[PDB]
Amino acid sequence: KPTAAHALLSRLRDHGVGKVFGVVGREAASILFDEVEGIDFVLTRHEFTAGVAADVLARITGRPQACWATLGPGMTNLSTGIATSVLDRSPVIALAAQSESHDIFPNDTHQCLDSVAIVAPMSKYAVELQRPHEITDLVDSAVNAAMTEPVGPSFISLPVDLLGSSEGIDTTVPNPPANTPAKPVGVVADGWQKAADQAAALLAEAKHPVLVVGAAAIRSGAVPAIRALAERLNIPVITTYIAKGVLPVGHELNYGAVTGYMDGILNFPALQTMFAPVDLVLTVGYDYAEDLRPSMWQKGIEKKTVRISPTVNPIPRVYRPDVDVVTDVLAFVEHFETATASFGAKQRHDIEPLRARIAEFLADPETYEDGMRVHQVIDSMNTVMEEAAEPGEGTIVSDIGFFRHYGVLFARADQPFGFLTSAGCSSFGYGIPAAIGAQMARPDQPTFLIAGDGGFHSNSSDLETIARLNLPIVTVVVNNDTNGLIELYQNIGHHRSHDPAVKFGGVDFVALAEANGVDATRATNREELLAALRKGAELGRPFLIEVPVNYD
Amino acid sequence: KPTAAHALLSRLRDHGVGKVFGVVGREAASILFDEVEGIDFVLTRHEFTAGVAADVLARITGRPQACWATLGPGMTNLSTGIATSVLDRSPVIALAAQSESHDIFPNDTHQCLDSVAIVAPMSKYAVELQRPHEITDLVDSAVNAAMTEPVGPSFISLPVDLLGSSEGIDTTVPNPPANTPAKPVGVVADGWQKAADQAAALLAEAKHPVLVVGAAAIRSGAVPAIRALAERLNIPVITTYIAKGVLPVGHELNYGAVTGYMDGILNFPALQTMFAPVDLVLTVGYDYAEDLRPSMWQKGIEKKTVRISPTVNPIPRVYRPDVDVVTDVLAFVEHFETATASFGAKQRHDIEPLRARIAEFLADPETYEDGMRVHQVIDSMNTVMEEAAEPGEGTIVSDIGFFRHYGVLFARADQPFGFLTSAGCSSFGYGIPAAIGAQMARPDQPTFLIAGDGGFHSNSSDLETIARLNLPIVTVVVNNDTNGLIELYQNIGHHRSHDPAVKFGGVDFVALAEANGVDATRATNREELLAALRKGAELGRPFLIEVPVNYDFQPGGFGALS
Amino acid sequence: KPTAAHALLSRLRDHGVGKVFGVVGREAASILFDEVEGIDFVLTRHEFTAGVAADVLARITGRPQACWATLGPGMTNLSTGIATSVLDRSPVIALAAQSESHDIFPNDTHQCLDSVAIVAPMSKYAVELQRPHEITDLVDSAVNAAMTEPVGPSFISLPVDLLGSSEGIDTTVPNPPANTPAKPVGVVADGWQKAADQAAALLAEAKHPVLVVGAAAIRSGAVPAIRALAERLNIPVITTYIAKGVLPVGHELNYGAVTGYMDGILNFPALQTMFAPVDLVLTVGYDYAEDLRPSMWQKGIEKKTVRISPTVNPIPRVYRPDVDVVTDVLAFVEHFETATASFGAKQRHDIEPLRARIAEFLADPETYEDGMRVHQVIDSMNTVMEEAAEPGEGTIVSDIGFFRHYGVLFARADQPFGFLTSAGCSSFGYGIPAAIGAQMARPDQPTFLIAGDGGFHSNSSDLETIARLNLPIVTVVVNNDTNGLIELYQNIGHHRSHDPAVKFGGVDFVALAEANGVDATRATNREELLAALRKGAELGRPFLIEVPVNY
C-alpha cells in the first residue's frame, strides 16, 4: 500500500517538481525515490550542493524546487543550502528525515537534533510530520509560504516511521488541485497607486532619474515592462549583482551593476560617475540582501528615492525612501506607464569615462610574469561565451571571493540571470551547485563557472556529480593558494597579513578534476585560456581550466 | 590598544587552549590571530573539519578546545561540527563572526542569520557579544556549560564591530583565575550511595553479570578503577563503539564492542551469544547517544539493570533501570569497591563461539574477484598498527558507513579512544578531521584512518590540510562506488535497490590524494595492503591507500536494527 | 476505559501529589478530576493564584506540586505563576490543555497558542503530549527536571483529544516505581573538597567572617548543620529574603535579612554597621535570584568570598568568588565541620547600636494623624503572631511593594519559611496564593498576610477562594491609594511624581472582603490593629484588616 513517501513525492509532482536533489540516509528503508513517475532523485556528494542546486533551479524556472537530507548532520549540512535560499530568495522545499516519532529525544537519541528549532529562524515555514496523511497539506503550506515575498525555503521534518506509514493514506481519492502560484504572492499596501502617482510627479520634475533594478523585479515578470519604460523615457538602468542582464549587452541604457568594491578595483571614481548627477533613484524591486546599499548611491547631489517592493520596508534604520510603493513590481510598472504615458524622454547623464575605464581593463594586453589578472580571465570568458551561446543565452556563474567582484563588473550577461552568484548568503563552494542548477535549467545553453581556489576546494568533491550527470559545464579555477579576499580584509583592518589564517599549500586542480573523471588543462595566458575555453565549450562533456592568478 | 579579539584569545589561552581550528571571513578585519602568544590558528578547507578536529582533540585531551567560523554560511557549516560535539559529548568552544551590531537584521542584512537561535538547540550555551569587555565572562560561561555533563559545545556570536573594539578593555588589570575544571562537573543525586548499595546486592545475587562501559566512564577518569574491579570479581567488560580499549587487546575480560549490525555482518547469533545467559547488566557511564540501546542486551533470559551516569535519566520511555545511580562514575566505582570488597569472584559466561566467529572473519584467506572484503582490510590495518605502535598506543579512526561497523567489531584498540568514530552524530566525512584531532593529540603515535568512498569524498578537500600540517596519518579508502550502507537500507525496506539514490561514478582516490600533495597507492589484496600500510606507517608524511571492496549483504540478517 | 487523563493523575499521585490547583476550561470534557482517589482539584479565580499556590506548597513541603490551566489564555495566565516558580525556585508541574492534536495551528485555530515555545524560556522542561500512553514518562521527566537545582517548573501541554484517549493505555499493568527525589538533585565539581579546604584556610585567617544563607541551603536539609557550625565558631548568620528563620527569633547570631532601603528606612547606617568590618563572606547556598547581590556586602574593607552552591556559577560577570565550592550544601557543611574542627571561636563585631535602633523603631509609640506607619503595622503583627503561634511555628506572608521591605527587615520568622515573599519574580498579587499555600502546608499554624492596596487589588478576587476553602488566613491590607514603591522610583529618577502612572481612587477593602464572604474591619492605630489581629487569629475563619498608611 502507498505510504507517506509516495504521498510526499506525488504532491511535489503536483506542484511541478521533477527533481529532488540530495543525499539519502537510513530513511531509504522508508523512501526509495521510484514511487512516483516524473520525479527523479539527483544524488550529490554533499547536502550543501543539493540545497544550492535546488535554489538556482528555482530561481531560473520561477517554480518551487526540492532538496533532501537525512536526520541530524544531514539536516545541518543541508541548512547552509537552506540559508542560501532564505537570503538569496528562492522557493525551495527542503526535506529532512528525523528519528522515529516515539524516539525523538533531541541531543540524546542517536543522530537526533531538534530540526524544526534549528531551521525555523532561517526559513519561511518549518514543521515536523505527525500524522502520515497530512503530508499533502504540509507540502501545500510549505509551497504557500515559500512562494510569498520575500521568497525562501520551507522545511519539513519527516520521522522515518511516519514516512514509511500508510496510516490514513488513500490514493484512490485524487489530490485536490495544487494551485501553485504562477509567480510570487506579494505584499500590497492600500494607496500604493497614490504613492506611484507621487513617484510619477517626482519623475516629472527630475533631470537625471535612474532605475536601480533588483531580482524581485525579475520574479515579478517585469523585465520586458521595465525595458519598454526605460527605452521610452530614456532612463538608465543600473542593477544589483544578480539582476545583470535585464538589458542586453551593448544596450545604451545598460549602465552596469554596482559593487561596493568597484572604486577600489578600478582605481576610478566609479560610484560618483554613476550617481553624482542623479536626482531621482527608483529602487525597483529593492532588497537590502542583494547588498546594493543606500550609501552606494548617496554620491554628489541630494536625491529623492522611490522604493518599489512586494514587501513592507524591513530596514527603516537604513533606508527611508521619500516614496515607498508596496506592491507587485509589474503592477507598479503598468500603473506607472499609464501615469507617465504623456511624458517625453529625459536627457541621461554621461558615464562614458567609466565605460572607457571598464573597457580598458577588459582589453589589458600585458602578459604578467606571476599569473594572469582576473579581468583578463573574465574578458576571455566573455569572448568564448559570446561565441558559444546564441544571442540572449548562456550563463556565467561565479563562486565567492575577491574575483567575484570582477565578475560583477566585467562578466557578460545577455539575459536575466545570465550572471549568477550568491548575493545574500555568499557561501563559498556556491559555484559548482549553481552551475549544476543553471545547466539543468538551460540544457542547451553554455554554462561557464569561475571560482577561486579557496571557495572551489571547499566544495570540489561534486565535480563527480558533474561528471556523473554529464553536465557540459566549463569551469575556470583562478588559483593563488590563498583565501584572497580575506587577506585583503586582514590588510584593511591591521595593515598586514597573517598567513596561518589565509594561506594554503598547492592543489593541482587539473589532477583533481581528472581524478573525478572531468577532463582538465592549465592555462597561463590569454592565448592558452581562449584555446582551453573554446575546447571546453565544444567538448560535449564537462571541462576544467586552472589559471594561476595574482591580485595587484 | 588591545581589542575584544585580544581579550577573547587571551581568555581561551587562560583555559589551556593552544589552537583555534577554522575558516576566517571578513572578520579578519577585526581579528588577525597573532594577537596572543601560545595560541595558533589552524586553517581548514571547510568549517565542518574545524569543528570535528576540536571535538576529537577535546575528547582525547579532556580539555576545552576551540573552533572558528565567519557569519552566515560560515556559522551554518560550523554547525555540523557543533552537532558533532553535542551528540558525541565534547567540550568545544565554537565561535562565529556576526554582522556589525547596529546592522543585525537576520535574513535581510547581507550574510546575516540569527546565529544564536540556530545554534541554541544544539549547544550547552549560546550567546551574542554586546559589550566588548564582557567577552572574558562569556568565555568563562561558555567553558562552564561545556564542561558540565553531558559535555558539549558552547557558542559565542561575535559582531565584527564589537570584536574589533577596545571599549572597556583593560589588559593592565590581570584576568581573574580561569579555574578550568580538570574533569567534567557532574550531576549527583542524594542517596546515590544507597542506590549503589542496592546495585551491590544485585551483583551478590547475579550468576552472570556484565559491565557495559560507555565513554562517560573514560571522561570521569575511571578506566583503571573499572579494570581493577572487573579483574577482582571476574566480570566481563563489553563496550560502546568509542569505549573500545578500556581493557587491552587480548585481556580475557575484553568481551568486545556491541553494534546492532553484528548479527548481520557475522551471519551469526552474536547478540544472543553475548547476552543470553546474562542476568545483570551494569551500564557504567550510560549514554543513549552512543547507540548501545536496551533492546540490544535484551536477549535470552530477563535481566536486572543498573544505570550509572553523572546525569539524570533523559529517556525513561526507553530505559527504566532497576537501580539508577546518578553520580560521578569514578565516585561510584570507589564506593562500589568498598560495598563489594568481600564478594567472591563470579563465574563469567561463555562467548567463545562469538570470539571464534570474529577470529574466523579476521583470518579470511580467500581472494575475491570483486575487491577485498572489509574484515580483511581491518585485519591488515590491525597487523601494521600493532607493528607501528608502542604497547598501549596508536589510534584507528573510522568515518561513517557500513565499513564503520566492521571497525567496531574488528578494529584494534589497545587504549581508551584507541578506536575513534562518531557514535552520537555520525556525520559522514568525519574521518579526516578526527584523524587530524587524534594525530595532534597523540603526535608520537601512529594514526590510521579508514573511510568509505561516500563519506570520504563528502569531505576529501581537507586532504590538503593534512599535507599542509604534515600530519603522518595513513588513510585507507574502501571504495565500492556506492553509499553502501544506504543501499543496504533500501534492500531492508523495499527488497530492492534504487541506484539513483546511492550509486556514484568512478573517483580515483590515489589521484585525488596526489592532487592534494599526499602520496598514495592502490592495494587490491592482503599482500598489497600490508605493503602499502607498512610503507605509510614509516613514511613520516601522510599516505593514502585506495582499496576496492564489495559487500554482498543479507538483508534478512539485520532484524536487530528494529 | 481509563484515559490519559487517568494516567496523568495517577502518575502525579505516584509522585506524592494530592492537590491540583487551577482553572478548568473545555478540556473538562476530557478530564473530570475525580478519576484518581487521593488527588483533589483546588479551583481558583485566576490561574496566577493556582501557579503561586503550587509554588509555595512545593517550597514548604519540599515535594513536587501541580497546577492546571486551559488552552491559550489559560496557559498565558498560568505563565506568571510558572515565572514565579522558575525565578523563586520551586519544583512545580504545570499542566495546560491544548487544541485537538490534528487542529494545532498556533495563532489561527481558536484559542491555539504555541504553548511549548512560550513556556520553554521560563521552565526546566516543556513538552507537548503526542501519544497518550507516554504521559507517564512525560510526568517522570517533568519531575526529574523540576527537582534538579536550580529547582523550577516543568510544563506539559495536553491536546484535548489525546487527553481523553485510552489508546495504548493499560492500567492493569502497574506503573514503574516513581523514585521522586527526597531533596533536589544538584551538580558536584571534581575537587570540591579541596575548594572547601581553601575556604577553611580563609576562615582560619578571618577576624570577622559571616555566613550569608540562601534557601538552597534549606532545600539541602542543612539548617541544623549550619546552626551548629555558626554556634561553635561564633559566626553571624545573615539571610536572603527567603531564608529568614534558619535561626530562631532572639538567637544571638541571627543578624536578620537586609535590603537596599534599610539605611533609609531606619535613618541609620545599618548596612555599613552590618558589613564594614567583615573580612570573609561565605555565601551558603548562593542564588543571585534571591536578590542579595554582591554589591550588598561590598561595604567598608575588602572581603574574601566563598560561594557554595549545587550549581555552576551562572553570573561570573557579577560574582567572582575567591573560592567557588560546587557541591551539595549539606555535604559541604559536613566536610567543613571536619576541616574546621579544631578552630577557636571568633569574635563578633558590634552591631548593638543597630539592634538598639531597630528595637526603638519598631516600638514607635506615636499615634500618627494620616494613618499608621508600616513599622508599627509589622510590629503589631509580630506581637499577635508570637501570641497565636506555638514556639517555632507560624507563617507571615508579604506581597510586593514598598511595605515589603518592612516585612523583610522586621517580620518574625521562627522557622525555615516562617516569612514568605517573592524575591526572584516579585509579581504583585503574590500574597493571597502564597497564604493559601502556606495555610494548606501548615493547617494547624497561624498564617498572616500583609499586602499593599496596589498589589492586593491586582489579585483580590481570590478572597472568594480563601472563603470557599475556609482557610483561617488573617490579611492586613496597608492602603495608601497608590503604587507607592513606583512613586518612590519616580522621585529617585526624576525628582518628582507623576500621578497618572501611580495613583488610584478609593477602594473599600473591608467591603471588598465582605462581598467575597470574608469578615473584615478597619484599624487606624496600634490599639485597633492589635485587637483586630487577635480577633482574626482566634476566629477560625479568614479575616481581613484594612489599615490606612502613609509613606
Ligand SMILES: CC1=NC(=N)C(C[n+]2c(/C(O)=C/COP(=O)([O-])O)sc(CCOP(=O)([O-])OP(=O)([O-])O)c2C)C=N1
Ligand atoms: C505583576 C506586576 N508586579 C509588579 N511588582 C509590578 C511593579 N510594581 C512593583 C515592583 O515590583 C517594583 C520593583 O521593585 P524592586 O525594586 O524590589 O524589584 S511594586 C508595585 C505596587 C506597590 O504598591 P502597593 O502594593 O500598594 O505597596 P506600596 O504602596 O509600594 O507599599 C508594582 C505595581 C507590576 N506588575
Ligand SMILES: C/C(NCc1cnc(C)nc1N)=C(/S)CCOP(=O)([O-])OP(=O)([O-])O
Ligand atoms: C573564506 C572566504 N569567505 C568567508 C566564507 C567562509 N566560509 C563560507 C561557507 N563562506 C564564506 N563566504 C572567501 S571569500 C575565500 C575566497 O577565496 P578564493 O575562493 O580563493 O577567492 P579569492 O582568493 O579570489 O578571494
Ligand SMILES: C/C(NCc1cnc(C)nc1N)=C(/S)CCOP(=O)([O-])OP(=O)([O-])O
Ligand atoms: C550517505 C550515508 N549516510 C547518511 C548521511 C548523510 N549525510 C551525512 C552528513 N551523514 C550521514 N551519515 C552513508 S552512511 C554513506 C556511506 O557510504 P561509504 O562512505 O562509501 O561507506 P559504505 O559504502 O561502506 O557504506
Ligand SMILES: [K+]
Ligand atoms: K554566437
Ligand SMILES: [K+]
Ligand atoms: K610495536
Ligand SMILES: [K+]
Ligand atoms: K564539503
Ligand SMILES: [K+]
Ligand atoms: K504562643
Ligand SMILES: [Mg+2]
Ligand atoms: Mg584564492
Ligand SMILES: [Mg+2]
Ligand atoms: Mg562505499
Ligand SMILES: [Mg+2]
Ligand atoms: Mg499602596
